[PDB]
Amino acid sequence: GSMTVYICPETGDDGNDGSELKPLRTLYQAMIITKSSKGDFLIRTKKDGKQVWEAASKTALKKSWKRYEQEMLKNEKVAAKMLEKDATEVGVKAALEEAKKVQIELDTSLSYI
């Protein structure tokens, strides 16, 4: 479990799925999709000229979640898009029964005749 959300304020977008390929542009949305808050959130930073993923800090996380409170606690009409992909499993078996005959020999001799 624990969905890692990737944030690129630079080249991603707040409306994405928050993957490494589709990074979010806000840490706030990372918290929305997962609602894990203290989960693993990685934000791309450019360190020594290279873009790397750095783990979000509790300070930045709470800074993002503080706003989550504001909109979600009061519950305004902004629509917090999470969306699940799919978890639908199908299955059906065919019902049938065996049908055989049996021989039943009876005397039918009549003991009282």
UniProtKB/Swiss-Prot annotation:
Highest taxon, organism lineage: Eukaryota
Compartments (UniProt record): Cytoplasm
Region (Region of immunological reactivity): 83-113
Family in the record: Belongs to the class-II aminoacyl-tRNA synthetase family.
Included stretch of the parent chain: 1 to 111 of 548
Organism of derivation: Brugia malayi
Function: Potentially protective antigen in lymphatic filariasis.
Name this polypeptide is given: Asparagine--tRNA ligase, cytoplasmic
